[PDB]
Amino acid sequence: LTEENAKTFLNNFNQEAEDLSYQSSLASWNYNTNITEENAQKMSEAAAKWSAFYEEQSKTAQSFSLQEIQTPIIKRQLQALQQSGSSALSADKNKQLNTILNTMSTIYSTGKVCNPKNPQECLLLEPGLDEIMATSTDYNSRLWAWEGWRAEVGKQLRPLYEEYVVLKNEMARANNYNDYGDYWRGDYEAEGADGYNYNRNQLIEDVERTFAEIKPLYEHLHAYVRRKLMDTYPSYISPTGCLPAHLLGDMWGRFWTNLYPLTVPFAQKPNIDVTDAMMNQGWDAERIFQEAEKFFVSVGLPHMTQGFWANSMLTEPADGRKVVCHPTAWDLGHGDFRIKMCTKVTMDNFLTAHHEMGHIQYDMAYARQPFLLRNGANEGFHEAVGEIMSLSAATPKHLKSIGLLPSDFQEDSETEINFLLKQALTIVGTLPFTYMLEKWRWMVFRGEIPKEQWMKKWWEMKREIVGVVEPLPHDETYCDPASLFHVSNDYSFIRYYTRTIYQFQFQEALCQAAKYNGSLHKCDISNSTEAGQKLLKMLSLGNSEPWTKALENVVGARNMDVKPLLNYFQPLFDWLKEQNRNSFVGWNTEWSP
Amino acid sequence: PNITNLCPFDEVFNATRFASVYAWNRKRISNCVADYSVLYNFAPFFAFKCYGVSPTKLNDLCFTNVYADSFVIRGNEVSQIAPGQTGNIADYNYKLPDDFTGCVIAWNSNKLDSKVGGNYNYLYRLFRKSNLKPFERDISTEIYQAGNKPCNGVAGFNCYFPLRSYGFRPTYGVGHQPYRVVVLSFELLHAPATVCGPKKS
Ligand SMILES: *[C@@H]1O[C@H](CO)[C@@H](O)[C@H](O)[C@H]1NC(C)=O
Ligand SMILES: *[C@@H]1O[C@H](CO)[C@@H](O)[C@H](O)[C@H]1NC(C)=O
Ligand SMILES: *[C@@H]1O[C@H](CO)[C@@H](O)[C@H](O)[C@H]1NC(C)=O
């Protein structure tokens, strides 16, 4: 019978897969912690063998017909295996698409804008132009850097994106999807028992529904940021207009977190930095990860493995080998969980250690699942369950409990307001950018935006949704979205929006589980086993169940809710309402200086 | 009575090479004095679960034959070496009867059975048509016919090779590291019992 054949096929696949996936992950780890040519080529052959095996098994798995499979775990495993992806095209089209992707990656990584009249002062984005976007206050220098990277990237990436859209549309329509946007929205599709059914076409309206009520908080934050930037830039920003695109602290305006020195509520009150306390008490990276482990065992989740301490790198090695600076949590398979992070003794690395160990705990919990179901419930869950640990680790209660912050520390309202504003610049400010970018990409892939009217549409929506105006008029020979890393390198972007919603939903559910009686931003889930069990019910699932069921297992709801997000930012929202009485909340679509 | 002719428990527990669980090694032990002192003394044991007899009174109650079955499995599968259990090892590699009188001993063997390149010398049976009877071995390498079409000796779709390798590596998690298992089965027959522990005076 077909179901028993599928069961034996999956048994043969899990055994072969786990081994090849472990070899690929171990080779990737050996390259990432030891950069050389031989490790790179070993990683190349290991990934080649694993990918060839995966496509070979996926072609055989497509022979099974799902109409006669009754058990939903086998059906979900076969659904996961039958996703061909980019292999649905012919070899010529797949090779052309890979060529376009590789040339986009190597032209984004080697993007170059150079000083006019000063030809020796040529600046790359990664070492020097990001410093100009993050720190510089001069209007003309930021206008230079923004317009120059827009020109020397958009002009070179517009035709590449023109055939990239067509090839991705062909790949998606070869996989029974309407467009490439529907292919990306298929990550949120959940087929399961009654009431847990989620559809791709539902997701857009859900996102729009969740953007219907984040909009007043974003409008008040935008008005406050606009007034403070008007204080910084006297005549270049209008009171009733949108913000200029190059004054937002990042290259693209994705995060507003670099506007915090310019937009600080109370400059006299310092931040909650405890780096000097770590320096005085002689903390090192081992103690940072031990404190994170103490937090995760206090909440009820299991201890770190001995292989975690033995095999991970938690420090710059400094013995002659090059490493990647980015922190990454690795689930190699066969019970091997590692963290690659060059941990310096700072508060940010302390929170990052909590975040990556949250990723490792999420990976450890679903190890009991079969190999194809050892993933997150959707793309947002995996990063949300690390962001909640980063949220709880940064509270003054947690810092006073572990001795980093003094026992007699006073939490006045001003430090809560400026902490909430910094969190808002990081978290709330990225939501209209994420929603507008994903909406533009979805409408481009759908064909709702005409091919020759791309740019004119994009700068309308940034004037409408994000409330950010272009500094200079751009015609259709520019490709202004493509200057971002995620869109030039074929990455889904709605995961950050869903991550942001799920993060505060999980945090409110855990704080209600831990019986916290105060404001949500002061909440700590330490020493609460019931919150850990409530979390671990979802963490043990993986993607074995629909993501709506896992979401109901944590928060008791089957969809995205932004009432926890507004509840988190409620003191800040009241403060922003209190200081926007005289000013005008909102923006005007027409270009105001 | 002086004490001599100890049973060769050094040969079973301290062997340099164990066997795969599909071809599990069986050694009969008879006409000697078996002292269980050395086994209890050894600290690394992960499981010393005994069935039908107490571990403390091993040295006084005495038996006719003692069977020592040695093999290597992965840590997660040590729970399957018990009466009444199911899994790949219980159903297809090593089955104990429901009235098993004896002990199961397991310990971690990373320093002896794990290789950085991968130890591909330990095998297990993943596919078999029917479950194993107690104390039965299957060393057959016949291609498992999972469908309706004949395999004709060649693997492929719905035709899998039943013996899969335990690719042990030292960086695996503790549940996946190689574990050496010795199963002591004690039996009494109508013959006079000649496997009896030490005497004191
Ligand atoms: C890094 O890789 C080289 C490649 O041969 C190897 O010789 C060296 O031992 C590796 N370093 C470490 C710390 O493993
Ligand atoms: C959690 O428990 C430990 C146990 O010693 C204690 O020291 C710590 O203060 C507790 N944390 C909180 C927030 O109560
Ligand atoms: C195996 O070797 C160890 C090493 O000293 C020894 O103590 C033990 O008695 C030997 N025999 C058994 C059965 O463990």
PDB file of C-alpha atoms in Angstrom, chain A residues 1 4-12 15-16 18-19 22-23 26 60 63-64 305-307 311 332-336 338, chain B residues 74 88 116-117 120 124 126-127 144 146-148 156-158 160-161 164-167 169-177:
ATOM      1  CA  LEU A   1       0.000   0.000   0.000  1.00  0.00           C
ATOM      2  CA  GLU A   4       3.464   1.807   4.083  1.00  0.00           C
ATOM      3  CA  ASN A   5       5.749   2.408   1.095  1.00  0.00           C
ATOM      4  CA  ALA A   6       5.969   6.069   2.109  1.00  0.00           C
ATOM      5  CA  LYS A   7       6.768   5.073   5.701  1.00  0.00           C
ATOM      6  CA  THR A   8       9.638   2.821   4.588  1.00  0.00           C
ATOM      7  CA  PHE A   9      10.810   5.481   2.112  1.00  0.00           C
ATOM      8  CA  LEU A  10      10.911   8.076   4.888  1.00  0.00           C
ATOM      9  CA  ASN A  11      12.729   5.618   7.176  1.00  0.00           C
ATOM     10  CA  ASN A  12      15.382   5.121   4.482  1.00  0.00           C
ATOM     11  CA  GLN A  15      18.827   7.630   7.993  1.00  0.00           C
ATOM     12  CA  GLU A  16      20.684   8.677   4.824  1.00  0.00           C
ATOM     13  CA  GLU A  18      20.845  12.826   8.875  1.00  0.00           C
ATOM     14  CA  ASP A  19      24.309  11.487   7.974  1.00  0.00           C
ATOM     15  CA  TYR A  22      25.739  16.185   9.430  1.00  0.00           C
ATOM     16  CA  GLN A  23      28.665  15.910   7.007  1.00  0.00           C
ATOM     17  CA  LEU A  26      30.380  19.815   9.905  1.00  0.00           C
ATOM     18  CA  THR A  60      11.262   9.968  -6.060  1.00  0.00           C
ATOM     19  CA  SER A  63       5.916   9.890  -7.312  1.00  0.00           C
ATOM     20  CA  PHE A  64       3.808   9.343  -4.182  1.00  0.00           C
ATOM     21  CA  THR A 305      25.316  19.643  26.309  1.00  0.00           C
ATOM     22  CA  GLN A 306      28.929  18.790  27.075  1.00  0.00           C
ATOM     23  CA  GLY A 307      29.572  18.828  23.338  1.00  0.00           C
ATOM     24  CA  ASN A 311      33.134  22.046  20.364  1.00  0.00           C
ATOM     25  CA  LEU A 332      24.661  20.008  13.075  1.00  0.00           C
ATOM     26  CA  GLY A 333      22.547  16.920  13.726  1.00  0.00           C
ATOM     27  CA  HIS A 334      23.066  13.801  15.881  1.00  0.00           C
ATOM     28  CA  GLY A 335      22.755  15.846  19.054  1.00  0.00           C
ATOM     29  CA  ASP A 336      25.503  18.304  18.075  1.00  0.00           C
ATOM     30  CA  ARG A 338      27.235  24.619  18.680  1.00  0.00           C
TER      31      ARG A 338
ATOM     32  CA  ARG B  74      23.821   4.100  19.930  1.00  0.00           C
ATOM     33  CA  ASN B  88      14.695  -1.012  15.204  1.00  0.00           C
ATOM     34  CA  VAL B 116      36.644  11.734  13.276  1.00  0.00           C
ATOM     35  CA  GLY B 117      36.179  10.519   9.711  1.00  0.00           C
ATOM     36  CA  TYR B 120      31.691   2.741   9.497  1.00  0.00           C
ATOM     37  CA  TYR B 124      22.483  -2.287  12.236  1.00  0.00           C
ATOM     38  CA  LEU B 126      16.877  -1.104   9.547  1.00  0.00           C
ATOM     39  CA  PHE B 127      14.496  -3.141   7.364  1.00  0.00           C
ATOM     40  CA  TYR B 144      14.451  -5.509   1.311  1.00  0.00           C
ATOM     41  CA  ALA B 146       9.089  -3.062   0.271  1.00  0.00           C
ATOM     42  CA  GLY B 147       6.722  -2.884  -2.697  1.00  0.00           C
ATOM     43  CA  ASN B 148       5.176  -5.259  -5.219  1.00  0.00           C
ATOM     44  CA  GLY B 156      16.633   1.646  -5.801  1.00  0.00           C
ATOM     45  CA  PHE B 157      13.051   2.747  -5.212  1.00  0.00           C
ATOM     46  CA  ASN B 158      11.044   0.401  -2.939  1.00  0.00           C
ATOM     47  CA  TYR B 160      16.536  -0.872   0.135  1.00  0.00           C
ATOM     48  CA  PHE B 161      19.671  -2.459   1.514  1.00  0.00           C
ATOM     49  CA  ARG B 164      22.838   0.669   7.574  1.00  0.00           C
ATOM     50  CA  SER B 165      26.032   1.960   9.122  1.00  0.00           C
ATOM     51  CA  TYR B 166      26.349   3.573  12.551  1.00  0.00           C
ATOM     52  CA  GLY B 167      28.615   6.364  11.403  1.00  0.00           C
ATOM     53  CA  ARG B 169      31.865  10.483  15.269  1.00  0.00           C
ATOM     54  CA  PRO B 170      33.248  11.901  18.540  1.00  0.00           C
ATOM     55  CA  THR B 171      31.261  15.143  18.277  1.00  0.00           C
ATOM     56  CA  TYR B 172      27.849  13.471  18.441  1.00  0.00           C
ATOM     57  CA  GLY B 173      25.444  14.135  21.267  1.00  0.00           C
ATOM     58  CA  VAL B 174      25.431  11.733  24.222  1.00  0.00           C
ATOM     59  CA  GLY B 175      22.329   9.931  22.977  1.00  0.00           C
ATOM     60  CA  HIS B 176      24.075   9.179  19.668  1.00  0.00           C
ATOM     61  CA  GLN B 177      27.545   8.201  20.924  1.00  0.00           C
TER      62      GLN B 177
END
